Amino acid sequence: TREARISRAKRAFVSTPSVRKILSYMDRCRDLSDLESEPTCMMVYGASGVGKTTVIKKYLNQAAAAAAAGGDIIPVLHIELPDNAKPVDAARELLVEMGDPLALYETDLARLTKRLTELIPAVGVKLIIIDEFQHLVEERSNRVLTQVGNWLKMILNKTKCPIVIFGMPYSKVVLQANSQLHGRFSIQVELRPFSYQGGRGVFKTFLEYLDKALPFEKQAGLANESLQKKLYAFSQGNMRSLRNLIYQASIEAIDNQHETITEEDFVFASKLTSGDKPNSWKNPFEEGVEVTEDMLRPPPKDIGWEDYLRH
Amino acid sequence: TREARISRAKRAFVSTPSVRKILSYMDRCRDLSDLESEPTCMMVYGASGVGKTTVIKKYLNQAAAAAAAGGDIIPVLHIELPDNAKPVDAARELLVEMGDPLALYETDLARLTKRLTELIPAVGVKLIIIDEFQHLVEERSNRVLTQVGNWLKMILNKTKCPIVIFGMPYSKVVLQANSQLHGRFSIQVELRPFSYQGGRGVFKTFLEYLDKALPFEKQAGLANESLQKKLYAFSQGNMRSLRNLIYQASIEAIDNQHETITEEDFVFASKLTSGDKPNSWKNPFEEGVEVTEDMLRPPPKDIGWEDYLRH
Ligand SMILES: Nc1ncnc2c1ncn2[C@@H]1O[C@H](COP(=O)(O)OP(=O)(O)OP(=O)(O)O)[C@@H](O)[C@H]1O
Ligand SMILES: Nc1ncnc2c1ncn2[C@@H]1O[C@H](COP(=O)(O)OP(=O)(O)OP(=O)(O)O)[C@@H](O)[C@H]1O
């Protein structure tokens, strides 16, 4: 097996220009705040499985690794809101994640607000990264509960620290709900999936560097005329479904001792990770799926909105 | 009677490839942690009566028998959380199980956290095995109380010692509740029941080696065309109900001096241990139960989820 080779196939990061744009803006957002004046506050949108969490994890490592190794400093944070979050819930989650208080027994919302305003300049917080902002949309109705948004405005104005709220694109209406919180988050970037198949685009050079990063020694066959068309036909832009197929195909080619990823175990990997794919979607790998013009259209505008459009 | 023979029938371990996978990963999880850097932290799921407690007991014996015989060292632990556990409750249970403090009079959660962090490197703890993780799911509501989970993250980061949390499959949502605790427990294995009857599978060789291990001298008749079909028809994959039937049949054949386990006392053992079995299930042993295609389907995906799906 060589689980070292398996973890090498699973932990493969390839920097796209969109990711490097987000990382440059994140480094900018941090280094601009003097923690006296009002911070910059970026909002980053992005659909289901574009690589937002990977961006936050890549930033976390490249920023706070040596500083966390130095001592209890924790310069940048990573917060994942709970579903249908109250200000007290997201406040105490922010508290128990940041350093080591108790903070989750005494829930009175005011004294724990005083605690984390006492503690944020104490440890030396430079940035707050919130991952889930679509949780403030109620599930079945379309009201967006503005208690956490107003509390975020409160904690932003009380202790001047830059907040980079990540979320799905239909979380925009939560920022549209509060006009003050809308005015605060000026910088808005859209981390949207891969665009076209025609070749010599960002998708080809991405698959070229991922072909380089795969643990096979000689070639993996990606980013050629035939296989790139079949790859985009399987996974439109969704980074996660593409990486899942490549991961399942890689570990399949590792299991039965092979040369590289070939058109032997890729078909098996396609039939394996085609459970989530929609009703009218066709698997381009099986017996005789002539990959069409209609399969290779760019992803729509409302790609990460559909759950909001469903009600 | 010969209670020696009875204890021989009761204590019968047969290693499956799934159990050897869990034991190899457990030995790996222990021997990788240097107790300076962040440990590996495996999660092992498994339904109601797959043989989790037998795996922990087999590991406990094969690991810590000679070291516990040497002196007060206790390298590996075995912890069974109480129901609706608070951090102080599971903390003091961990304390009073590990070595010999008093530890269960002074409940202040902070000084006993300090006590067990003082004591874990003192005695030389190498591994912590937690058996019940589904207790952190509240009974009638579907909130999963995250105080014990956050305390487990706390004790993991404070003293770097590998924790192998066992539990039922619907305990997964407790690991989904805390994103940091989710990120920590990377290695996740599913100890699921036996799959098919068709023959020449893991079930046949399992019953072959269990036929060997039984205290009868000549044969027990298991893992043949007829009896294997009747055996899977009685107990789908549930190791405990299979082993109970075999145990009751064995001690029935021991009571009235017999040659082996025959189709005389097996019918009596079937009617004896068929109380727990569901409403629509049929006993394949009684008078004329022609064992059908519909009886021998593999166990479902959500085999250990049903109590979570009930509310
Ligand atoms: N630049 C990259 N190179 C290679 N793989 C990548 C890259 N970016 C992301 N991935 C992969 O994409 C997958 C998507 O996981 P991730 O959780 O980051 O997505 P996400 O968009 O945050 O999902 P969600 O919206 O559900 O939170 C991961 O398996 C990750 O390894
Ligand atoms: N490999 C094996 N060979 C023979 N018998 C086994 C094997 N594994 C488990 N058993 C038997 O299966 C039964 C189940 O016991 P055990 O408590 O280990 O299951 P469990 O899934 O942990 O149950 P619970 O979750 O209720 O604690 C025991 O009687 C044990 O002897």
Helix pair angle (A225-234, A202-213), 10° resolution: 100
Distance, CA of B71 to CA of B69 (rounded, Å): 6
Ligand 1: does its nearest atom lie under 6 Å from the Cβ of A213? no
Q: Does A202 touch chain B (CB under 8 A)?
A: no
Compute the nearest-CA separation of A51 from chain B (Å): 16
Nearest-CA distance from B302 to chain A in Å? 16
Q: Ligand 1 within 6 A of A205 CB? A: no
Q: How far apart are CA A207 and CA A273, in angstroms?
A: 19
Ligand 1 atom closest to A46 (CA): 21
Half-sphere exposure of A57 (CA within 13 A, CB side): 11
CA distance, residue A267 to nearest chain B CA (Å)? 24
Task: Output the CA B232–ligand 2 centroid distance in Å.
Answer: 17
B179: nearest CB among A80, A96, A102:
A80
Name the residue type at position A140. R
Strands B188-191 and B163-166: unpaired
- Cβ-in-10-Å burial (0-12, 13-18, 19+) of A175 comes to buried
Probe target for ligand 2 pocket from B13, B16, B54, with the most ligand atoms within 8 Å of CB: B54
State whether the beta carbon of A127 lies less than 6 angstroms from ligand 1. Answer: no
**Which SS3 state, helix, strand or coil, does residue B178 take?**
coil
CA-CA-CA-CA torsion sign (A136, B184, B188, B78):
negative
Q: Is A224 left (phi over 0), alpha (psi -120 to 50) or beta?
A: beta
Say if CB A295 and CB A281 are below 8 A apart.
Answer: no
φ, ψ of residue B76 to 5 degrees: the values are -110, 150
Check pocket membership of A13 for ligand 1, CB cut-off 6 A. Answer: yes
Q: Does A106 touch chain B (CB under 8 A)?
A: no
Q: Which residue has the tokens 């070291």?
A: B67
Residue B179: CB atoms within 10 A of its CB come to: 18
CB contact under 8 A, B147 and A104: yes
In what side-by-side order are the strands of the sheet with B188-191?
A: B128-130, B163-166, B43-46, B188-191
Tell me the two tokens of residue B102: 């008093």
Q: For residue B62, how many other CB atoms are within 10 A of its CB?
A: 12
Question: Any chain B CB within 8 A of the CB of A97?
Answer: yes
Does residue B172's CB lie within 6 angstroms of at least one atom of ligand 2? no
Contact A80 B150 (CB under 8 A): no
Contact assessment for residue A124 and residue A73, using Cβ atoms and an 8 Å cutoff: yes
The string of DSSP letters for B240-290 reads HHHHHHHHHHHHHHHHTT-SS--TTTHHHHHHHS-SSS-SS---TTSS---
A131 Cα nearest atom in ligand 1: 27
**Cα–Cα distance for residue pair A78/A127, rounded to 1 Å:** 9
Ligand nearest to the CA of A50: 1
Task: Compute the residue count for chain A.
Answer: 311
Rounded distance, CA A25 to CA A27, Å?
Answer: 6
User: Can you read off the two tokens belonging to residue B242?
Assistant: 């299979």
Regarding the beta carbon of A195 and ligand 1, being less than 6 Å apart is answered: no
| CA distance readout (Å), B124 to A98, B41, B120 | 30, 18, 6
| Chain B CA closest to residue A78 | B180
A45 closest CA partner among A302, A234, A232, A299: A302
Contact residues on chain A for B154, CB-CB shorter than 8 A? 100
Q: What residues have CB less than 8 Å from B243, skipping those under 6 apart?
A: B12
CB of B12 shorter than 6 A to ligand 2 = yes
For residue B222 and ligand 2, the question of a CB distance below 6 A is answered with no
Looking at CA atoms only, how far is residue B145 from chain A in angstroms?
11
Q: In this structure, are strands B43-46 and B188-191 parallel, antiparallel, or unpaired?
A: parallel
Q: State whether B154 and A104 contact (CB < 8 Å).
A: no
Instruction: Tell me how far the alpha carbon of residue A57 lies from the centroid of ligand 1, in angstroms.
Output: 10
Cα B123 to Cα B75: distance, rounded to the nearest angstrom: 8
Instruction: For residue A102, list chain B residues with Cβ-Cβ distance below 8 A.
Output: 110
User: Any idea which residue has 């961990």 for tokens?
Assistant: B94
Distance in angstroms (rounded) separating the CA atoms of residues B144 and B158: 24
Experiment type: cryo-EM
Nearest to A104 among B150, B179, B180 (CB): B150
Considering only CA atoms, give the Rg of chain B: 22
Question: Which of A96, A105, A107, A129 should one mutate to test binding to chain B, selecting the residue with the greatest count of B CBs within 10 A?
Answer: A96
Q: Which residues contact A171 (CB under 8 A, 6 or more apart)?
A: A45, A133, A134, A136, A137
A201 to each of A195, A218, A303, how far by Cα in Å?
Answer: 9, 24, 20
